[PDB]
Amino acid sequence: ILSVDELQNYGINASDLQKLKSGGIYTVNTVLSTTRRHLCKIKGLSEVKVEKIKEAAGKIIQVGFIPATVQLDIRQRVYSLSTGSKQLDSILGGGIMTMSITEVFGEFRCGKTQMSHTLCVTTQLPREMGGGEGKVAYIDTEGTFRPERIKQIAEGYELDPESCLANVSYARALNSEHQMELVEQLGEELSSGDYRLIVVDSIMANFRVDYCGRGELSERQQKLNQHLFKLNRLAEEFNVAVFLTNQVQSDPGASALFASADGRKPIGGHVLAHASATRILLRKGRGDERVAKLQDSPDMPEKECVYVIGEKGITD
Amino acid sequence: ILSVDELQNYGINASDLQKLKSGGIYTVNTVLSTTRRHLCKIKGLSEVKVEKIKEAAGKIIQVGFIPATVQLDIRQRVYSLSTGSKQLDSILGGGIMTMSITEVFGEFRCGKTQMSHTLCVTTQLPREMGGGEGKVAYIDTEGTFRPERIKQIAEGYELDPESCLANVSYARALNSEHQMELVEQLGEELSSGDYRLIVVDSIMANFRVDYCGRGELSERQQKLNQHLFKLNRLAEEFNVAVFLTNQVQSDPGASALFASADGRKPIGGHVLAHASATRILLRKGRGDERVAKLQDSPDMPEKECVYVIGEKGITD
Amino acid sequence: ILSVDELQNYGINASDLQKLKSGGIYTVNTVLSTTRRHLCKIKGLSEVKVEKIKEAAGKIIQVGFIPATVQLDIRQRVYSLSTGSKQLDSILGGGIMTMSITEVFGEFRCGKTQMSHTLCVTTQLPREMGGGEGKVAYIDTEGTFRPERIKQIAEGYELDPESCLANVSYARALNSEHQMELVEQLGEELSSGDYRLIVVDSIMANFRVDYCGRGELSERQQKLNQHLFKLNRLAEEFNVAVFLTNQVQSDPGASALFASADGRKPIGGHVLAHASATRILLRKGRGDERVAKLQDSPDMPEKECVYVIGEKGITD
DNA sequence: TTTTTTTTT
DNA sequence: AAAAAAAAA
Numbered sequence A, B, C: 001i002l003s004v005d006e007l008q009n010y011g012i013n014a015s016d017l018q019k020l021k022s023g024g025i026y027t028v029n030t031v032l033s034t035t036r037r038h039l040c041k042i043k044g045l046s047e048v049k050v051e052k053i054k055e056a057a058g059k060i061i062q063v064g065f066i067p068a069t070v071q072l073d074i075r076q077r078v079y080s081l082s083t084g085s086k087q088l089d090s091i092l093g094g095g096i097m098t099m100s101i102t103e104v105f106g107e108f109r110c111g112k113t114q115m116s117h118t119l120c121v122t123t124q125l126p127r128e129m130g131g132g133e134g135k136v137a138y139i140d141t142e143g144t145f146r147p148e149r150i151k152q153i154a155e156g157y158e159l160d161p162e163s164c165l166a167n168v169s170y171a172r173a174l175n176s177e178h179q180m181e182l183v184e185q186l187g188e189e190l191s192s193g194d195y196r197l198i199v200v201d202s203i204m205a206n207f208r209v210d211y212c213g214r215g216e217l218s219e220r221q222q223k224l225n226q227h228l229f230k231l232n233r234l235a236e237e238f239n240v241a242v243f244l245t246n247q248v249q250s251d252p253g254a255s256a257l258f259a260s261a262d263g264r265k266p267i268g269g270h271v272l273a274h275a276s277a278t279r280i281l282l283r284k285g286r287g288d289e290r291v292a293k294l295q296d297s298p299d300m301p302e303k304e305c306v307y308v309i310g311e312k313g314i315t316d
Numbered sequence D: 001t002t003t004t005t006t007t008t009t
Numbered sequence E: 001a002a003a004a005a006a007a008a009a
Ligand SMILES: Nc1ncnc2c1ncn2[C@@H]1O[C@H](COP(=O)(O)OP(=O)(O)OP(=O)(O)O)[C@@H](O)[C@H]1O
Pocket: A106, A107, A108, A109, A110, A111, A112, A113, A114, A115, A149, A152, A309, A310, A311, B273, B274, B275, B276, B277, B295, B296, B297, B298, B299, B300, B301, B302
């Protein structure tokens, strides 16, 4: 995709181009999707440079009203990534859609952190297999990124492990304000390359800790909203899917609607329920088989799939 | 591992270095994994000192995107500690993995407090035996730390008791807010030395008491989450394993899923189920033989091992 | 042991010292083992007084990480109290260990309320006999504290009855919320004196009644946990043993594990099974001889002893 | 917006 | 074989 260098020949001459890049801006799209107010906060582009930069960036491409069908076409390069269990891919429409945020929340031992590895391995398969020719970005917020698992699943999928463990990029976010730093940089590698999905285990494992009590709740939800917006924007201007794992909390309140089943009601509140495009609840079933329920999708209606997490990732 | 003195020659000059250390910060890593907001709460580093400190600490080492394989390598120094029963070490992949939290929960007389002593003794064995060249930190929240047992097990393992009883460090946490104080200090001794595992008998024996009733539940779960995060962080930036013993509660609710077996459903809720990387349920079997079931691991799938707690710790 | 007056000369000046004492706090240790939150609920020490009090109390003594061996030494003053039947004292390691909770549960006529008298009398013997130079605290929750029995056993042990019946302190708890009141006060007499063991016949004889039905079960288990924690703490900061008698319930459920022997499964649930350090089951044998089985100890493994309750207490 | 607890006969 | 109740930042 065109970089922030194409407009370098429009008067934007790269004296401050280093300034721009340092700010994270690497593509042209990211120049259009950045508010002026935020662009005049990078210490060296005050007012007029930003006006000329925006005039240029708009001269490259236009954002008006593509009627509806040029959209349906531009919407054809979605690369629905397979999850590994035919039933689930069928209930989701083929798998994890790209240029969108897909969230998975359930109590422990539901393998919602194993679906991450299954995707990490099943994204490097030819398009006619479910994924395709894509690297992966992985942001771990609770550890548990065992590459041994990646190699096991690769071998089980008839694929050179060494190869796959090379197309993955790993980053161990340490605290919330570092997790948010990471996405900015991530805006770079996605500028030139083939990244299909970004993965965030426990999107809120950190925020749950850096902000404790309803004394600092609002300041947490606001940071979380900014973080989720940055993601949803990346996943959109790079045709990249986003996969977030979430957690569950128990409601010590009433015994209605209905009487039981506490392993629900994810954490994050509404700021995260809205931002997520697809929601999925993973529940424990019988023996070693779990139930995946769809709860919020714009394409599908609803259903319940059953899947067993075996030795080749998520299957049945 | 490098201390917080290496950057002392970067402008951080140690005028306030005592301030920093008093705050618990002893290594450089701990400087990177501490949010600014929390660092400007130590009464003497307001804004700019923290900025320069972070610039320095980042100048020493980088945290970007190690692709995947440098990870698989850096992940090679795991020191899987043996538990003492070949079958169990085989079901866990070799034993208690380091840089991770392993939880063990079951009803009384399951010796989940005896596995602690068995580890305390079996951590000081050459790596080719299961542990290796490591001291031990022990935080007792219910008493029952009989060093006599440590000496008995040592003698049974052909090892100088006096020696082992010297490489152990003991602390009797008195109340929750003291148990949480202890880990901060513990951040110090782990700065320079050879500590392999930290042990916490009844991670929640105290929290269960300092906060009674669902009137103060949330305020308990939040403190517990902070405490568990601090641990998981220590165990990660020091290549040290963490071993927590938990307790069991009975569900006076329905008679489904299935009809019986009440000695399950540990306490702590979900805040502790997520934070734990490995879960293990210890159940009473026949005669003097117990059954260890694995329930949540990122490496293994699942299995049931059988072990007898004899006079040399946990064996068969 | 040092009182709460030693720190009186640290700024804590005794203006509110009466406030502190009224709260039960009499020693310094009890000041360290009391959470701040609970200390700012005594109506006259809000925030700063508690901070200075804790600073002082910590200035007297330190609680860090005594490595392991200073522990094995400080653990040398255990005063294992003899029970009266050589076989039982041998199966327990010498008798009832101090600074620990020992529970005894069995069906009626097992004399689990006679072992209480036997201890009451066999605690005032020179250390080389099994007990030693200790008064006794007795909390009766079902009556049946016949001092005549105490005098009979004393005479049988070659000891001045009048003397022993003076070193005993008796309290007839009337209801649960009074039984819990009693331990607080008890925290006083143990401040200055020689008390070796505390005794509680039917630790749950009252709780079984003040809270009926699973509608108020949780509120009963929580109070019981608080009560047991207070005990375990007293028994620890005063080198005093605790001896609890329990009761038995019958399981109208299945006929497995194995088919019979209903006189087991004590009451109290798990909140009491964990808190107890040593468990013992008293069963009826042949003629006038009972069988004592050990079930949960941190020192011993396991065994079955046989003892006959004769006219000199518990013997064979 | 956050946060589960507790066997009896 | 069949039994519920518990708040507070
Ligand atoms: N190769 C394997 N290694 C480890 N576990 C496996 C393997 N194959 C299957 N499993 C099983 O699959 C399940 C995986 O759980 P999973 O990783 O989804 O937990 P999680 O929900 O991601 O973690 P948490 O909920 O604690 O964040 C476990 O029950 C595990 O035992």
